[PDB]
Every structure is written in structure tokens, then in C-alpha cells.
């Protein structure tokens, strides 16, 4: 079975597509080498099409079946609730793609009679019709990158209509929110906040007598997912206590949408047929996580890797285990990869065994070390800041509906680059435009949030602890990665950012209130005469439930 078949009709944009970074004074302050920054477009879709289109081999074995049964056992503890129309409508982003049937996300959120009646009929049809493939739209996603010699083609997104998406939520939101944790336990990555996640990686690393770790990068994971994989995934969902209508909906969604179906371009033309994972449905993150974990757990047994602890976030996979020795780890890792390959998860790049935790990257991120005010070692997550910086420059120049810079500040708050560059650059702008109190959209684990920049200090304390405001003596390797990133992108040197932050810090303090709290906490790094930083009372009061429960990337999820 081919992941995809194509009619020859093009993947088309539904509007004009910017690919170049404008020459704008505000963005130019952040990043001068504007021609290094680009956004993907429709024009590179045929290149992507070529990469995601292949035959799949899958041979299942007893290790695979053993693990599956174990997961199902855990799954059968779960009792999933059916979401009400109102509840599902509330989870729809304000700017989610309109329906082809004469209503949009706004109508969904407002529970208008048109949207709601169409949603009911979609739901009833799921219950009645078990076979008819549901239509999907295929689009080229616009994402911003820095050039590296040369360019990434656009990713392809495949999604059903708004009415169907609201119905997936009713049938499956509780399931995709609750079940991965029940099944994978501590290995489910999306349950951790940043501090918890770092805690778990470090503890796991320090628990082994001789640790070895690796990341495993499946070549085009969504395309490696077979119809059997998606039906096995359904077999796990079906172990939950379900309302009968949910049980039918899942069955019908599986056969009509999840396993595959027709692809239609922005212009309504038949583009082809998908027989693999759609990027843009509710079950993608859950399904990818389960499938990845299943295959990897069985492949570990096949490779005889000892005392494995997995961390899985969709298609992202980290394994930490007990070293058997350099040669034998290399052999065992190769056997793991052949097992994965047989299970239809071949590697992009061969995995490499690693004996230093900081050398392992999970979801762009690695563990690094710094010291807090008292000189105590603190572990934190960081990443190469090249893409975050390129995207922030873009978002400075162009109004984008989702702000990666804001998500990056939240998730990488303790980092040198987030603190000195991103906070300084954006607080300066917001402060000059008097927009500090204006809420902005970002994402956390794929789900969309509306966040007030003035609540960043409380947010950051909750997610990272107070040490996020006091870190210093960063590793030489972190410092260099950052420093040399700034040279490449024509981002001013850190000393410039210190100078700018002092000025911003002062303006923030002068304003008093929540603004001044941002000044004390966010920019204490910038002054020699430091304020003593105590817990923020409002931090404990934040309702961050739902933040670090599950992954929702591609799932059309909005949280208020
Ligand atoms: C299938 C798919 C495609 C693209 C992005 C994502 C995704 O949700 N994330 C992701 C995954 C891998 C790579 C990647 O770069 C990535 N990026 C982002 C996020 C998130 C995500 C980001 C980090 C992560 O784990 C490491 C981590 C965890 C907590 C704090 C810091 C790092 C897991 C995770 F799902 S985000 O939290 O939604 C917003 C942010 C601006 C941080 C971008 N998923
Ligand atoms: Cl990013
Ligand atoms: Cl200075």
C-alpha cells in the first residue's frame, strides 16, 4: 500500500503567500540578515509530495503483539466521556478554517443555529454511515525557517471540514486527553511541564548505573503509519468505557477518516488518496504517540536493550537505557532500528548512541545546566535558537495569527536566548505600542492559548520555578551555540541586548503594577544590583489545568 496516490491536480494555495521577510525597522533591530529568513509556500509542495509518497512494509511479531495486549489492558481502565456540542464548540479556535457549508469558527463558538444543525447532521451521519470516506482538504503549510546550504519544502496538512472536527471532539477529546497517560504512564511526554520534564529526564538519566541514550527519527512518520496501525490504535480506544454513540462515531471515524480517504485541493479538485496518517485530525498526536511507543517498546525487546525508559511525544522518541559497552550498544541500536523498520518506522538518520544527556535532543530540545542565585546547579531545556529567532523576526514584521515567540518565551523561559533576546525585543515593542495588556495567541503542546504578556512572570514561575529569573553561568557550549547563531542571522550581540533590556526594565518599573513585576522578575538578569525575588502570589492562583495534559498538534484545540 502506498501512503499516497496522486491524480496530478496541484496542491493549491487559497490566497496569496508571502515567502520573504520584509525590510521593517522593528524586525531589522532583531535580525539584519533578512534574506536568510523565508517561509514555505505551495510552490514547494510537489517536492514534499515526493518525500511523503512511498510503499510501506510492515511485519508484525510476538513482541509487537505482547506490547499491544499490555497497552490494551491499561486502556481498559479508562472511562471516556462524550462531549456536549457546547463543550466541543468551545474548543474550536476563533480562526479555525470555516466550513464549506456556510458557517465558520465564530458561528461554532457562538452556537449559531446553522453551525449547530450542521454539526448534528454530521454526527447523525457518522452514526448511520460506517463506510463512506469523508472528504479532506490538503494544503501546503506556511512555516518560517533560516536557510542552510538549501530549503525545506512546505509540509502538507490534511484536514476534514469544520463540522467533522467538532464531531471528533465530542467522540474523542476526553479519550485523546486521558488515555495516553493511562497506557504509557511516565513515558507520555505531554503530561510534563518544562520543569517536570527536565526532572524526569535527569532522574531517568541518573537512575542508570551506566546510562546510554538516543533519539530515534522516523523518516516522515505520518506516512509510515499503515491502516493496520490506525486500526490497532482504534482497538486501544475501544477498550475504554464509551457511550454507544461515541463507540459508533469512533468506529465510523476510523474507517471513513483516520485510515485514509480522498484529498481535495483549495479549489475543490480531486488531488488523490491517502492511506496513512492525516496531520490535521484530533487523533494524530495521541495516535502517533501510541503507535510510536508500541513499535519502539517492541523494538527494544527485539534489540535486547536493557532497562529502557522511553519518552514519547507523537513521533518524537527518546530511549534511555543501561549501557552494555560501546560496541554492544552500537550493535543493539542497529537491531532496534531493523525492528522499527519491519514495523514500518524506518529511520531518517541512523540513531546514534549517546553517553551525555545534553547531547540528546527531544522535540528540538536538549538538557543543559546553569546556576541559580545561590550557585546551585539547575537543569533546564533549551534548543538551537535559529528557528525561534527567524520566526520572531517574521512575527515582528507581519501580523501572524499564532505567535511562536510567545510560546517560545513560555517554554524556554530559563534560556539565555529567550531571556536576553525574546523578552527584551517583545516587551520593548509592546511597551512602545502600549499593548502590554493585549492578549495574544500562542501554542503549548500544539494547543492554542490566549495569553496576556503581563502574566508571563507568574506563568514562568509555575512552569519553571523562580530559578528561571536568576540563572547564570550557562554552559560554554550553550553560550557558543547562541553567540554563533546571532552572527549567522545578523542578530545583535548579547551585550546589545543587555543594554536594551536595562532601558526596557526601567520603563516597566516606572509604570508600576503588573508591568513593574515584569521588570523585576523578567529582567533581573540585566542589572548588577539585583532585587531579591520571592514567589509571586498570583502564580499559585493561575488555573493551568489542561496545559500539560496531552498533545494536540494538528487537532484544532483552543483553550481559554
Ligand atoms: C506534530 C508537530 C509539529 C510541529 C510542532 C509540534 C508541537 O506541538 N511542538 C513541537 C514538537 C517538536 C519539535 C518542536 O520544535 C515543537 N515546537 C513547538 C511546540 C511543541 C513542543 C515543543 C517542545 C516539546 O518538548 C520539549 C520541551 C518541553 C517543555 C519545555 C521546553 C521544551 C514538545 C512539543 F510538543 S509548542 O509547545 O506547541 C510551541 C512552540 C513555540 C514551543 C513550538 N508538533
Ligand atoms: Cl519555533
Ligand atoms: Cl550593561
Coordinates of C-alpha atoms and ligand atoms in Angstrom, one line a residue:
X1 CA 0.0 0.0 0.0
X2 CA 1.2 3.5 -1.0
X3 CA 1.0 6.2 1.6
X4 CA -0.5 8.4 -1.2
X5 CA -1.8 8.3 -4.8
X6 CA -2.0 11.4 -6.8
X7 CA -4.3 12.5 -9.7
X8 CA -2.0 15.2 -10.9
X9 CA -4.2 18.1 -9.7
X10 CA -2.0 20.6 -7.9
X11 CA -1.8 21.5 -4.3
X12 CA -3.1 25.0 -4.5
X13 CA -3.0 28.0 -2.1
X14 CA -6.3 29.6 -1.1
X15 CA -4.8 33.1 -1.1
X16 CA -1.5 35.0 -1.7
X17 CA 1.6 33.6 0.0
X18 CA 4.4 35.6 1.5
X19 CA 7.8 33.9 1.4
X20 CA 10.2 36.7 2.1
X21 CA 11.0 38.7 5.3
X22 CA 10.1 42.4 4.8
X23 CA 12.6 45.1 5.4
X24 CA 11.0 46.6 8.5
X25 CA 12.7 48.7 11.2
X26 CA 11.4 46.7 14.2
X27 CA 12.3 43.3 12.8
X28 CA 15.6 44.7 11.5
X29 CA 16.5 45.6 15.1
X30 CA 16.3 41.9 16.0
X31 CA 17.7 40.4 12.8
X32 CA 19.6 42.1 9.9
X33 CA 20.2 39.2 7.5
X34 CA 16.6 39.3 6.3
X35 CA 17.3 37.3 3.1
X36 CA 18.2 34.3 5.2
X37 CA 14.7 34.2 6.6
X38 CA 12.0 32.5 4.4
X39 CA 8.5 31.0 4.7
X40 CA 7.4 27.8 2.8
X41 CA 4.6 28.0 0.2
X42 CA 2.6 25.9 -2.3
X43 CA 5.4 26.3 -4.7
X44 CA 7.4 23.5 -3.0
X45 CA 4.5 21.1 -2.5
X46 CA 5.4 18.7 -5.3
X47 CA 8.8 18.3 -3.6
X48 CA 7.1 17.4 -0.4
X49 CA 4.6 15.1 -2.2
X50 CA 7.6 13.2 -3.5
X51 CA 9.1 12.7 0.0
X52 CA 5.9 11.5 1.7
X53 CA 4.8 9.1 -1.0
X54 CA 6.2 5.5 -0.7
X55 CA 5.2 1.9 -0.3
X56 CA 5.3 0.7 3.3
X57 CA 6.5 -2.7 4.6
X58 CA 5.1 -4.0 7.9
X59 CA 5.8 -7.3 9.5
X60 CA 4.3 -7.8 13.0
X61 CA 5.7 -10.2 15.5
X62 CA 5.1 -11.5 19.0
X63 CA 6.9 -8.7 20.7
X64 CA 4.6 -6.3 18.9
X65 CA 1.5 -8.3 19.9
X66 CA 2.7 -8.7 23.5
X67 CA 3.1 -5.0 24.0
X68 CA -0.2 -4.3 22.3
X69 CA -2.1 -6.5 24.8
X70 CA -0.3 -4.8 27.7
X71 CA -1.4 -1.4 26.4
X72 CA -4.9 -2.6 25.9
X73 CA -5.0 -3.9 29.5
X74 CA -4.1 -0.4 30.8
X75 CA -6.6 1.2 28.3
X76 CA -9.4 -0.8 29.7
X77 CA -9.2 1.1 33.0
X78 CA -10.4 4.2 31.1
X79 CA -13.9 5.6 31.1
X80 CA -14.2 8.4 28.5
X81 CA -17.0 11.0 28.4
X82 CA -18.9 12.1 25.4
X83 CA -18.5 15.9 25.0
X84 CA -21.6 18.0 24.5
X85 CA -22.0 20.2 21.4
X86 CA -21.4 23.3 23.5
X87 CA -18.2 21.8 25.0
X88 CA -16.8 20.8 21.6
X89 CA -17.7 24.3 20.1
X90 CA -15.8 26.0 22.9
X91 CA -12.6 24.1 22.0
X92 CA -12.7 25.3 18.4
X93 CA -10.1 28.1 17.7
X94 CA -11.7 31.5 16.7
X95 CA -9.7 31.4 13.5
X96 CA -10.2 27.8 12.6
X97 CA -10.9 27.1 8.9
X98 CA -14.6 27.8 8.0
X99 CA -16.9 25.0 6.9
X100 CA -17.7 24.6 3.2
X101 CA -21.3 24.5 4.4
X102 CA -21.8 28.2 5.2
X103 CA -20.5 28.8 8.7
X104 CA -17.2 29.4 10.4
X105 CA -15.3 29.1 13.7
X106 CA -17.1 32.2 15.0
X107 CA -20.5 30.6 14.4
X108 CA -19.4 27.4 16.0
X109 CA -18.1 29.3 19.1
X110 CA -21.4 31.3 19.3
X111 CA -23.5 28.2 18.9
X112 CA -25.4 29.6 15.9
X113 CA -28.4 27.6 14.6
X114 CA -26.7 27.0 11.2
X115 CA -23.4 25.7 12.6
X116 CA -25.2 23.6 15.3
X117 CA -27.7 22.0 13.0
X118 CA -25.0 21.1 10.5
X119 CA -22.9 19.6 13.3
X120 CA -25.9 17.5 14.4
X121 CA -26.3 16.1 10.9
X122 CA -22.7 15.3 10.6
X123 CA -22.9 13.4 13.9
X124 CA -26.0 11.6 12.9
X125 CA -24.3 10.6 9.6
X126 CA -21.3 9.2 11.5
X127 CA -23.8 7.0 13.4
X128 CA -25.6 5.9 10.3
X129 CA -22.9 5.6 7.6
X130 CA -19.9 3.4 8.5
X131 CA -18.2 3.3 5.1
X132 CA -18.3 6.5 3.0
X133 CA -14.9 8.1 3.1
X134 CA -15.0 11.6 4.5
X135 CA -13.5 14.3 2.3
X136 CA -10.3 16.1 3.3
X137 CA -8.5 19.2 2.2
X138 CA -4.8 19.1 1.5
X139 CA -2.8 22.4 1.9
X140 CA 0.8 23.4 1.9
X141 CA 1.6 24.9 5.4
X142 CA 3.5 28.2 5.7
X143 CA 6.3 27.9 8.2
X144 CA 9.4 30.2 8.7
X145 CA 13.0 28.9 8.6
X146 CA 16.5 30.1 8.2
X147 CA 18.3 28.9 5.0
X148 CA 21.0 26.3 5.5
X149 CA 23.2 25.3 2.4
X150 CA 19.2 24.7 0.8
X151 CA 15.5 25.0 1.7
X152 CA 12.8 22.9 3.3
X153 CA 9.8 22.3 1.1
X154 CA 6.4 23.0 2.7
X155 CA 4.8 20.5 5.0
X156 CA 1.5 19.2 3.8
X157 CA -1.6 19.4 6.1
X158 CA -4.7 17.2 5.7
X159 CA -7.9 18.1 7.5
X160 CA -11.6 17.4 7.3
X161 CA -14.4 20.1 7.4
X162 CA -15.2 22.1 10.5
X163 CA -18.4 20.1 11.2
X164 CA -16.4 16.8 11.3
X165 CA -13.8 18.4 13.5
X166 CA -16.4 19.5 16.1
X167 CA -17.7 15.8 16.0
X168 CA -14.2 14.3 16.6
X169 CA -14.1 16.4 19.7
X170 CA -17.4 15.1 21.0
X171 CA -16.4 11.5 20.4
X172 CA -12.8 11.6 21.2
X173 CA -11.5 14.6 23.1
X174 CA -11.7 13.0 26.5
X175 CA -10.1 9.9 25.1
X176 CA -7.1 11.6 23.5
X177 CA -6.7 13.7 26.7
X178 CA -6.8 10.8 29.2
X179 CA -5.8 7.6 27.5
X180 CA -2.2 8.1 26.5
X181 CA -1.2 8.6 30.1
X182 CA -3.2 5.7 31.3
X183 CA -1.4 3.5 28.8
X184 CA 2.1 4.9 28.6
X185 CA 2.3 6.3 32.2
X186 CA 5.6 8.2 32.8
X187 CA 6.7 7.7 29.2
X188 CA 3.9 10.0 27.9
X189 CA 5.8 13.3 27.3
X190 CA 2.9 15.7 27.1
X191 CA 2.0 15.3 30.7
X192 CA 5.0 17.2 31.8
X193 CA 5.5 20.9 32.3
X194 CA 9.0 22.1 31.4
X195 CA 10.4 21.7 34.9
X196 CA 8.7 18.2 35.3
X197 CA 10.0 17.1 32.0
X198 CA 13.6 18.1 32.8
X199 CA 13.2 16.5 36.2
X200 CA 12.1 13.2 34.6
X201 CA 14.9 13.1 32.0
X202 CA 17.6 13.9 34.6
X203 CA 16.2 11.4 37.2
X204 CA 15.9 8.8 34.4
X205 CA 19.5 9.5 33.3
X206 CA 20.8 9.4 36.9
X207 CA 18.9 6.2 37.7
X208 CA 21.0 4.1 35.3
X209 CA 24.4 2.7 36.5
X210 CA 25.8 3.4 33.1
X211 CA 23.4 5.5 31.0
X212 CA 23.1 5.4 27.3
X213 CA 20.5 7.4 25.4
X214 CA 19.3 8.1 21.9
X215 CA 16.7 9.9 19.9
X216 CA 15.0 7.9 17.0
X217 CA 13.9 9.9 14.0
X218 CA 11.4 8.1 11.8
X219 CA 11.5 9.2 8.2
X220 CA 8.2 11.0 7.6
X221 CA 6.3 9.3 10.4
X222 CA 2.7 10.1 9.3
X223 CA 3.4 8.4 6.0
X224 CA 4.8 5.3 7.8
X225 CA 1.5 4.8 9.6
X226 CA -0.4 2.0 8.0
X227 CA -4.1 1.2 8.0
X228 CA -3.3 -1.6 10.4
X229 CA -1.6 0.9 12.7
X230 CA -4.7 3.1 12.8
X231 CA -6.9 0.1 13.3
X232 CA -4.7 -1.1 16.2
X233 CA -4.9 2.4 17.6
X234 CA -8.7 2.1 17.4
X235 CA -8.5 -1.3 19.2
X236 CA -7.0 0.6 22.1
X237 CA -9.7 3.3 22.2
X238 CA -12.3 0.7 22.0
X239 CA -11.1 -0.7 25.4
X240 CA -12.5 2.5 27.1
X241 CA -15.9 2.7 28.6
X242 CA -17.7 4.6 25.9
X243 CA -21.2 5.9 25.3
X244 CA -22.7 3.8 22.4
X245 CA -22.9 6.8 20.1
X246 CA -19.2 7.5 20.9
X247 CA -18.3 4.0 20.2
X248 CA -20.1 4.1 16.8
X249 CA -18.6 7.6 16.0
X250 CA -15.1 6.2 16.6
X251 CA -15.7 3.1 14.6
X252 CA -17.0 5.3 11.7
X253 CA -14.3 8.0 12.1
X254 CA -11.7 5.2 11.9
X255 CA -12.9 3.7 8.7
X256 CA -14.1 6.9 7.0
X257 CA -11.3 9.4 8.0
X258 CA -8.5 8.0 10.1
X259 CA -7.3 5.1 7.9
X260 CA -7.4 7.3 4.8
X261 CA -9.7 8.9 2.2
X262 CA -9.8 11.3 -0.7
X263 CA -7.8 14.5 -0.9
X264 CA -9.2 17.8 -2.3
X265 CA -7.2 20.9 -3.0
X266 CA -8.3 24.5 -2.1
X267 CA -10.0 24.7 -5.5
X268 CA -12.3 21.7 -4.9
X269 CA -10.4 19.4 -7.4
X270 CA -9.6 15.8 -6.6
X271 CA -6.0 15.6 -5.6
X272 CA -5.6 11.9 -4.7
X273 CA -6.0 9.5 -1.9
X274 CA -4.4 9.0 1.5
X275 CA -3.7 5.7 3.1
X276 CA -1.7 6.9 6.1
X277 CA -2.0 9.4 8.9
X278 CA -3.7 12.7 8.3
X279 CA -1.7 15.5 10.0
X280 CA -4.8 17.6 10.8
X281 CA -7.2 15.4 12.9
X282 CA -7.9 15.0 16.6
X283 CA -6.3 11.7 16.9
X284 CA -2.9 12.5 15.3
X285 CA -0.9 13.3 18.4
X286 CA -2.5 10.6 20.5
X287 CA -2.3 8.0 17.7
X288 CA 1.2 8.9 16.7
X289 CA 2.3 8.7 20.4
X290 CA 0.7 5.3 20.9
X291 CA 1.9 3.9 17.7
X292 CA 5.5 5.2 18.2
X293 CA 5.6 3.9 21.8
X294 CA 4.1 0.5 20.7
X295 CA 6.7 0.0 18.0
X296 CA 9.6 1.3 20.0
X297 CA 8.7 -0.8 23.1
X298 CA 8.6 -4.0 21.0
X299 CA 11.8 -3.0 19.1
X300 CA 13.6 -2.5 22.4
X301 CA 12.7 -6.1 23.4
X302 CA 13.8 -7.3 20.0
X303 CA 17.1 -5.4 20.3
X304 CA 17.5 -6.7 23.9
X305 CA 18.2 -3.1 25.2
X306 CA 18.3 -3.3 29.0
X307 CA 16.2 -1.3 31.4
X308 CA 14.7 1.1 28.9
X309 CA 12.9 4.2 29.8
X310 CA 11.1 5.9 26.9
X311 CA 10.0 9.4 26.4
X312 CA 7.4 9.8 23.6
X313 CA 5.7 12.9 22.2
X314 CA 3.9 11.9 19.0
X315 CA 6.5 10.8 16.5
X316 CA 9.3 12.1 18.8
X317 CA 11.1 9.3 20.6
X318 CA 13.9 9.2 23.3
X319 CA 15.1 6.0 24.8
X320 CA 17.4 5.9 27.9
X321 CA 18.8 2.6 29.0
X322 CA 21.7 0.7 30.6
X323 CA 24.9 0.6 28.5
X324 CA 26.3 -2.8 27.7
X325 CA 29.5 -1.3 26.3
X326 CA 30.3 0.9 23.3
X327 CA 30.3 -1.9 20.6
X328 CA 27.4 -3.7 22.0
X329 CA 25.3 -0.6 22.4
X330 CA 26.0 0.2 18.7
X331 CA 25.0 -3.3 17.7
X332 CA 21.9 -3.2 19.9
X333 CA 20.9 0.2 18.5
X334 CA 21.2 -1.2 14.9
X335 CA 19.0 -4.2 15.8
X336 CA 16.4 -1.7 17.3
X337 CA 16.4 0.1 14.0
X338 CA 15.8 -3.0 12.0
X339 CA 12.9 -4.0 14.2
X340 CA 11.4 -0.5 13.8
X341 CA 12.0 -0.7 10.1
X342 CA 10.0 -4.0 10.0
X343 CA 7.3 -2.4 12.0
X344 CA 7.1 0.4 9.3
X345 CA 9.1 3.0 11.1
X346 CA 12.4 3.3 9.3
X347 CA 14.9 5.9 10.4
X348 CA 15.5 9.3 8.8
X349 CA 19.1 9.3 10.1
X350 CA 20.5 6.3 11.8
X351 CA 20.2 6.8 15.5
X352 CA 23.5 7.4 17.5
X353 CA 24.0 6.1 21.0
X354 CA 24.9 8.9 23.4
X355 CA 26.6 8.9 26.8
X356 CA 26.0 12.5 27.7
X357 CA 22.4 13.7 28.4
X358 CA 22.9 17.1 26.9
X359 CA 23.7 15.5 23.5
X360 CA 20.2 14.1 23.2
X361 CA 17.5 16.2 21.6
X362 CA 13.8 15.6 22.1
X363 CA 11.3 17.8 20.2
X364 CA 14.1 20.2 19.2
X365 CA 15.2 20.4 22.8
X366 CA 18.2 19.3 25.0
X367 CA 19.0 19.3 28.6
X368 CA 21.6 21.9 29.7
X369 CA 22.9 23.3 33.0
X370 CA 23.1 26.7 34.7
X371 CA 23.4 28.0 38.3
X372 CA 20.8 30.0 40.3
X373 CA 21.4 33.0 42.5
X374 CA 22.8 30.8 45.3
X375 CA 25.1 29.0 42.9
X376 CA 23.1 25.7 42.9
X377 CA 23.1 23.7 39.6
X378 CA 19.8 23.9 37.7
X379 CA 18.9 21.8 34.7
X380 CA 16.6 23.3 32.0
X381 CA 15.5 22.7 28.4
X382 CA 17.0 24.7 25.6
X383 CA 17.3 24.4 21.8
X384 CA 19.2 26.0 18.9
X385 CA 17.5 29.4 18.7
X386 CA 17.8 29.8 15.0
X387 CA 14.2 29.0 14.1
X388 CA 12.7 30.7 17.1
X389 CA 14.7 33.9 16.2
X390 CA 13.8 33.7 12.4
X391 CA 10.1 33.3 13.4
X392 CA 10.2 36.1 15.9
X393 CA 11.6 38.4 13.2
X394 CA 8.8 37.3 10.9
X395 CA 6.1 37.9 13.6
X396 CA 7.6 41.3 14.3
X397 CA 7.3 42.3 10.6
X398 CA 4.0 40.5 9.8
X399 CA 0.8 40.0 12.0
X400 CA 0.5 36.3 12.3
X401 CA -2.4 34.6 14.0
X402 CA -0.2 32.4 16.2
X403 CA 2.9 33.9 17.9
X404 CA 5.7 31.4 18.2
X405 CA 7.8 34.0 20.0
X406 CA 5.3 34.0 22.9
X407 CA 5.2 30.2 23.1
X408 CA 9.0 30.1 23.0
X409 CA 9.2 32.6 25.9
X410 CA 6.8 30.4 27.9
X411 CA 8.5 27.1 27.2
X412 CA 12.2 28.2 27.0
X413 CA 11.9 31.0 29.7
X414 CA 15.1 29.9 31.5
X415 CA 17.2 30.1 28.4
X416 CA 19.8 32.7 27.7
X417 CA 18.3 33.5 24.3
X418 CA 14.7 33.7 25.4
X419 CA 15.5 36.0 28.3
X420 CA 18.0 38.4 26.7
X421 CA 16.7 38.5 23.2
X422 CA 13.0 37.5 23.0
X423 CA 11.7 39.1 26.2
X424 CA 13.8 42.3 25.6
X425 CA 12.7 42.6 22.0
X426 CA 9.0 42.0 22.5
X427 CA 8.5 43.8 25.9
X428 CA 10.2 46.8 24.3
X429 CA 7.8 46.7 21.3
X430 CA 4.7 46.1 23.4
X431 CA 5.7 48.8 25.8
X432 CA 6.3 51.3 22.9
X433 CA 2.9 50.4 21.3
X434 CA 1.1 50.3 24.7
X435 CA 0.0 46.7 24.1
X436 CA 1.2 45.0 27.3
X437 CA -2.3 44.2 28.4
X438 CA -3.4 42.9 25.0
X439 CA -3.8 39.1 24.9
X440 CA -2.0 37.1 22.2
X441 CA -2.3 33.7 20.8
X442 CA 0.4 31.1 21.0
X443 CA 0.6 27.4 21.3
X444 CA 1.7 25.0 24.0
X445 CA 2.0 21.3 23.1
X446 CA 0.1 22.1 19.9
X447 CA -3.0 23.6 21.6
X448 CA -3.8 27.3 21.2
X449 CA -4.0 29.7 24.2
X450 CA -4.7 33.4 24.6
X451 CA -2.1 34.9 26.9
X452 CA -1.6 38.3 28.4
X453 CA 2.1 39.2 28.3
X454 CA 1.8 40.8 31.7
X455 CA 1.1 37.3 33.3
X456 CA 4.4 35.9 32.0
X457 CA 6.2 36.2 35.4
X458 CA 3.5 34.0 37.2
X459 CA 3.3 31.6 34.2
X460 CA 7.0 31.2 34.1
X461 CA 7.3 30.6 37.9
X462 CA 4.7 27.9 37.7
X463 CA 6.2 26.2 34.6
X464 CA 9.9 26.6 35.6
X465 CA 10.3 27.7 39.2
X466 CA 11.8 31.0 40.4
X467 CA 15.2 29.9 39.3
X468 CA 14.1 30.9 35.7
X469 CA 14.6 34.5 36.8
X470 CA 18.1 34.0 38.3
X471 CA 20.0 31.6 36.0
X472 CA 23.6 32.5 35.2
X473 CA 26.9 30.7 34.3
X474 CA 25.4 29.0 31.4
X475 CA 27.5 26.2 29.8
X476 CA 30.2 27.2 27.3
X477 CA 28.5 25.1 24.6
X478 CA 25.2 26.8 25.1
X479 CA 26.8 30.2 25.1
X480 CA 28.6 29.4 21.8
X481 CA 25.6 27.9 20.1
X482 CA 23.7 31.1 20.9
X483 CA 26.6 33.5 20.1
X484 CA 27.3 31.9 16.7
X485 CA 23.6 31.7 15.9
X486 CA 23.5 35.5 16.3
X487 CA 26.5 36.0 14.0
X488 CA 24.8 33.9 11.3
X489 CA 21.5 35.7 11.4
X490 CA 22.9 39.2 12.0
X491 CA 21.2 39.4 15.4
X492 CA 23.0 42.0 17.6
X493 CA 25.4 40.6 20.2
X494 CA 24.2 39.8 23.7
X495 CA 25.9 42.9 25.1
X496 CA 23.5 45.0 22.9
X497 CA 20.5 43.1 24.3
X498 CA 21.7 43.8 27.9
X499 CA 21.8 47.5 27.1
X500 CA 18.4 47.4 25.5
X501 CA 16.9 45.3 28.5
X502 CA 18.1 47.9 31.1
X503 CA 16.2 50.6 29.3
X504 CA 13.1 48.4 29.0
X505 CA 13.4 47.2 32.6
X506 CA 13.4 50.8 33.8
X507 CA 10.3 51.8 31.8
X508 CA 8.5 48.8 33.1
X509 CA 9.3 49.6 36.7
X510 CA 8.2 53.2 36.2
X511 CA 4.8 52.1 35.1
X512 CA 4.2 50.1 38.4
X513 CA 1.7 47.3 38.7
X514 CA 1.9 44.1 36.7
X515 CA 4.3 45.9 34.3
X516 CA 6.8 46.6 37.1
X517 CA 6.5 42.9 38.2
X518 CA 7.6 42.0 34.6
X519 CA 10.5 44.5 35.2
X520 CA 11.7 42.9 38.5
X521 CA 11.4 39.3 37.5
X522 CA 11.9 39.1 33.7
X523 CA 14.9 41.4 33.6
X524 CA 16.7 40.9 36.9
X525 CA 19.4 39.3 34.8
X526 CA 20.2 42.7 33.3
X527 CA 21.2 44.6 36.5
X528 CA 24.3 44.2 38.8
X529 CA 22.2 45.2 41.8
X530 CA 19.7 42.5 41.9
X531 CA 16.3 42.6 43.5
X532 CA 15.6 39.6 45.8
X533 CA 12.9 37.6 44.1
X534 CA 10.2 35.9 46.1
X535 CA 7.2 33.8 45.0
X536 CA 4.5 35.7 43.1
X537 CA 1.2 35.2 45.0
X538 CA -0.8 35.2 41.8
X539 CA 1.3 32.3 40.5
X540 CA -0.3 29.7 42.8
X541 CA -3.7 31.1 41.8
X542 CA -3.3 30.5 38.0
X543 CA -5.5 27.8 36.6
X544 CA -3.0 26.0 34.4
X545 CA -5.1 22.8 34.4
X546 CA -5.2 21.5 30.8
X547 CA -1.8 22.9 29.9
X548 CA 0.4 19.8 30.4
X549 CA -2.1 17.0 30.0
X550 CA -1.9 16.0 26.3
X551 CA -0.5 16.8 22.9
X552 CA -2.9 18.4 20.5
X553 CA -0.8 19.4 17.5
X554 CA -2.9 19.4 14.3
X555 CA -6.0 18.8 16.4
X556 CA -7.8 22.2 16.2
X557 CA -7.8 22.8 20.0
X558 CA -8.3 26.1 21.7
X559 CA -8.1 26.7 25.5
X560 CA -9.2 29.8 27.4
Ligands
LIG1 C1 3.5 17.4 15.1 C2 4.0 18.7 15.5 C3 4.5 19.6 14.5 C4 5.1 20.9 14.9 C5 5.1 21.2 16.2 C6 4.5 20.4 17.2 C7 4.5 20.7 18.6 O1 3.4 20.7 19.2 N1 5.7 21.1 19.3 C8 7.0 20.7 18.8 C9 7.3 19.4 18.6 C10 8.6 19.0 18.2 C11 9.5 20.0 18.0 C12 9.2 21.3 18.2 O2 10.2 22.3 17.9 C13 7.9 21.7 18.6 N2 7.7 23.1 18.8 C14 6.7 23.8 19.5 C15 5.8 23.3 20.3 C16 5.6 21.8 20.6 C17 6.6 21.1 21.5 C18 7.7 21.8 22.0 C19 8.6 21.2 22.9 C20 8.3 19.9 23.3 O3 9.2 19.2 24.2 C21 10.4 19.8 24.7 C22 10.1 20.9 25.7 C23 9.1 20.7 26.6 C24 8.8 21.7 27.5 C25 9.5 22.9 27.5 C26 10.6 23.1 26.6 C27 10.8 22.0 25.7 C28 7.2 19.2 22.9 C29 6.3 19.8 22.0 F1 5.2 19.2 21.5 S1 4.7 24.2 21.1 O4 4.8 23.9 22.5 O5 3.3 23.9 20.7 C30 5.0 26.0 20.7 C31 6.5 26.2 20.5 C32 6.7 27.7 20.1 C33 7.4 25.9 21.7 C34 6.9 25.3 19.3 N3 4.0 19.1 16.8
LIG2 CL1 9.7 27.9 17.0
LIG3 CL1 25.5 46.8 30.9

